[PDB]
Design a protein around this ligand. Structure first.
Ligand SMILES: NC(=O)c1ccc[n+]([C@@H]2O[C@H](COP(=O)([O-])OP(=O)(O)OC[C@H]3O[C@@H](n4cnc5c(N)ncnc54)[C@H](O)[C@@H]3O)[C@@H](O)[C@H]2O)c1
Ligand SMILES: NC(=O)c1ccc[n+]([C@@H]2O[C@H](COP(=O)([O-])OP(=O)(O)OC[C@H]3O[C@@H](n4cnc5c(N)ncnc54)[C@H](O)[C@@H]3O)[C@@H](O)[C@H]2O)c1
Ligand SMILES: NC(=O)c1ccc[n+]([C@@H]2O[C@H](COP(=O)([O-])OP(=O)(O)OC[C@H]3O[C@@H](n4cnc5c(N)ncnc54)[C@H](O)[C@@H]3O)[C@@H](O)[C@H]2O)c1
Ligand SMILES: NC(=O)c1ccc[n+]([C@@H]2O[C@H](COP(=O)([O-])OP(=O)(O)OC[C@H]3O[C@@H](n4cnc5c(N)ncnc54)[C@H](O)[C@@H]3O)[C@@H](O)[C@H]2O)c1
Lengths: 277, 277, 277, 277
């Protein structure tokens, strides 16, 4: 009945936001879940970090749908710990079909020639190398199951075009597109699809925070979401200021399900027409 | 509980193949249908043409789903007849929400500097100008309904890259991407999404014919589908020789439904990884 | 000594503007020229048309460089007359190495679903089919010379993205990109390169006219180039309001010369960063 | 009368190969040179590393052209040493106008989920982070000169599509496209252009080595260049097996000179039609 009935999905960054939304949506449609998140502070994070209670709440939501979920608190930069958590989760759930490499950060925001080395490096470590780590940890289990699979990497509008003062994020998200194409070419012969979703602004903590509001409305002292919306909406072709996590989850579900069985190598924007500008 | 419950979809080329599949798939998900097709011969067509009986069979399939359907025999090259058919269908069904500009041909197959003027022109007339005519005829009804909507143009892998001896088709299908982007920019402010699907080989009459087998297997005497499949599969990253009409319809359904409410301006390949080459 | 010494170049639209500039620039660098232009009125042209005296002035400029030039007044929509003029010019100059498909128009400017059929059709005939006609007329002579060659098609920023109210031009210029890729794939095995140049606004008659000024500054009564410049400059990443014909000619020269001997299939924007938006 | 008369160009990886060719080609056209190279071994390098004598030979070639050159042995991974070298070169030559971020490696060659963590990281360090370091070190001098300038990043065909067993290289080279676009957007307002060149196989040490021949011809015992060439040529639309360093330098010269004064944000393939496939 469900669009991914009988499948198992591994989701990074599942404590909250889009990753929690992917976990719930795929569980609604029949999938059991391996959910990991760092659940702690991140250097120079421009907004509140996630907590262990966040990930436990994702787990309760999935359990409420009478689906199984394995959670682990792990940093995608630690490959050996990430591999260990994935291995244990697949040992419990019995298979791995879907990988959603969703964990990521937004930090800092300077001119690209002024970004500091460690701020550049943390961005590359999480948003590019951490994506590679995530796919690398899960893919041996998709291969050994021998049933094909579907892998979704979260890039960004910033993986195809640049906005000022985000250049380390831009470079990482472009590199995610290259990871999607490389994995797609290499895993295609095993009927494993690899695609990317490219969101515009999404109404998560990564956007709905004081730092982001102030960068978009420097004219203001205490800018709020109402003041940020008109600027953000000017980036879009549809008259909306941002999309929701459920919009990204619906794209991930399409890509994860048999309804896209022959779709691979695709950059799918969920961007309200940002990339038409 | 259908994914396009309460909607009306206008579909060109609906007598058979992908267009028939789109009408049946959207009807399964709750939409009433306006279905048009030339139902008649086309100059230099490399395979059997459609019949009035084909479109009557599409109507029977949609009515078996307890949905309403208006059909019409009309050539997308004849804008006034097309507009009159769409106006009458909308008067009968009460609204228009979805347009799928699917009608098209494959003809001929020569070096681009050797294609005859009228063969080039018929291809541009049907596969590029006919698509514009189709959207132009439908969009006043979507606009006047005031509920937004979703428009899907059928391009091709050949809308993004070229294969030898199909250059008039390549040119037209690239133009269709242009139409998608222009319509998306102009109609976005009215919450009307415009996207394109880009199929690889699909198991329809346009591909499954003797002229195609020979354009792919000159070495053979009377090549059939089994001799064509290895060649067609070499164009793909996934090990399949072609996709099915239902694969295109699943992509069209995604783009037509509220699950893609903020997806616009997108070229969505359904191509088994062709564009990764 | 010259960067295209000993070569012959066929240039459409050479009466004025970019095409005249290509003729002079290639002649400066050693090439003899076949120059054609309609040299007369065009339906619904939004600015002054070219004259026979324009083309004679291009000829004098080329002759002043002690280069040979053949001119003909011919419409690129008339393939038989265009082929006849090209055949005669190659019979005189002895070879054909370079083709620049530069002739084009800007007309009208309505919402895409309101553009009239004949206005759409004239746009397609000149800017898409006329480009095909141009390449088709010249390419048998490049092939028969057996020395390779280089073919440049003038597309536009509008061949990769859409601006409102130009959708027939957008569709045609996208189709030019498809022509470039199709010809590139088919002619590559004969060492014939095929590329496109994609200009932003260029300071020619096609942009520097009252209609264009008024469309960009509706707030004004008599808007001039000084009022148009700030709006046009907002489309660019570099702080300039437009590029010059010589900027396009320098790109065409690079592509025409042995310095790009292995460059083929490329869309080269000369766009002040428009496509970064 | 040189095409970059009076300019200063800073070039990374200038000891040999394309970087040496860029220094010599820009010097031929009138530029003074700041040339840096590690001139030393690199972990897991699949071919001979460069030497201090290589870079001294680049200096001799540039001085034979009666141009000035400052050389330095520095690793692009070490930003402070890199910045110190560039600061000293600019103090000696008086200005900086052109930056060519050319230094890079090819290493290893495994399935992407089997590449070891440190092999991945060295590739990201050199081919992505090293490029950022190179532009970051040079651009304050271009900015403070107040004359605009031109920056060229060396990506690859692998910056736009993937080949099997090179996924860490693919990811890094895609990131380099991101860097080009971000730098172009941020530096455009200062009339500083930023573009990328995308080579196919080039006849340098990075390709002409025994490990590459075997990664292309497993069937052979000791494959040489003649057994590699047919395979490499099948990746191309033009019938050549590779391009030469001089072909890349001609593209770099175009992008560095005033003949491309309004070209920015462009990915310029020099690829014999690879990206047409
Ligand atoms: N939010 C946007 O506007 C936007 C736009 C483009 C792309 N994205 C991408 O969407 C994805 C999800 O972000 P979101 O909007 O859900 O934000 P979020 O901050 O609400 O969620 C991201 C989650 O990733 C986790 N995470 C971050 N670094 C991690 C690490 N090193 N190891 C493990 N877990 C880690 C975080 O703790 C957090 O729970 C990210 O890749 C982000 O770059 C977001
Ligand atoms: N079949 C493929 O491999 C392939 C690949 C890429 C794109 N496509 C595109 O998919 C779309 C559907 O084709 P299909 O595979 O269903 O083939 P098909 O020939 O079975 O269906 C196309 C339908 O379009 C109708 N049609 C053609 N010209 C018409 C006109 N002038 N006016 C009205 N109706 C007209 C035909 O009568 C036919 O019923 C077309 O745009 C085609 O170019 C197909
Ligand atoms: N000017 C711009 O801002 C801009 C932007 C993008 C693309 N372009 C393209 O640049 C090319 C040259 O335009 P321009 O800026 O030199 O303008 P222009 O009007 O000064 O020159 C174009 C020339 O093409 C000739 N021509 C037009 N239709 C013809 C036909 N049917 N047969 C023969 N000759 C014909 C015209 O008579 C004219 O002499 C065109 O393809 C145009 O679309 C221009
Ligand atoms: N050769 C090809 O086929 C090919 C294809 C695509 C891209 N490229 C790119 O072209 C560029 C030049 O490579 P090439 O073909 O001249 O090869 P090469 O190995 O002859 O030259 C590259 C030079 O970069 C220098 N270098 C490497 N790492 C460095 C570091 N950390 N710090 C300083 N210098 C360093 C090397 O010492 C060497 O002198 C590279 O970016 C490469 O990735 C080459």
């Amino acid at each position: 009945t469900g669009r991914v009935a009988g499948k198992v999905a591994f989701i990074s960054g599942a404590a909250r936001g889009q990753g929690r939304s992917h976990a719930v949506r795929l569980a609604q449609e029949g999938a059991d879940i391996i959910a990991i998140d760092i659940c702690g502070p991140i250097e120079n994070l421009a907004y509140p970090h996630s907590t262990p209670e966040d990930l436990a709440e994702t787990a309760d939501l999935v359990k409420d749908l009478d689906r199984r979920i394995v959670t682990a608190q792990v940093d995608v930069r630690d490959f050996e710990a990430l591999k260990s958590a994935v291995d244990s989760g697949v040992e419990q759930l019995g298979r791995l079909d879907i990988i959603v490499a969703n964990a990521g950060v937004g930090t800092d925001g300077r001119k690209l020639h002024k970004i500091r080395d460690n701020v550049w490096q943390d961005m590359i470590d999480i948003n590019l190398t951490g994506v590679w780590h995530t796919v690398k940890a899960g893919v041996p289990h998709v291969l050994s199951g021998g049933r094909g699979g579907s892998i979704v990497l979260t890039s960004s509008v910033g993986g195809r075009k640049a906005y000022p003062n985000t250049g380390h994020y831009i470079a990482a998200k472009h590199g995610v597109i290259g990871l999607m194409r490389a994995f797609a070419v290499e895993l295609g012969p095993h009927m494993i699809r690899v695609n990317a979703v490219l969101p515009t602004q999404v109404s998560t903590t990564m956007v709905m925070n004081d730092q982001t509001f102030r960068l978009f409305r420097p004219d203001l002292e205490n800018p709020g979401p109402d003041d940020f919306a008109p600027i953000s909406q000017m980036m879009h072709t549809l008259p909306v200021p941002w999309v929701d996590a459920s919009d990204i989850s619906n794209a991930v579900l399409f890509l994860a399900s048999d309804e896209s069985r022959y779709v691979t190598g695709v950059s799918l924007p969920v961007d309200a027409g940002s990339l038409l500008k």
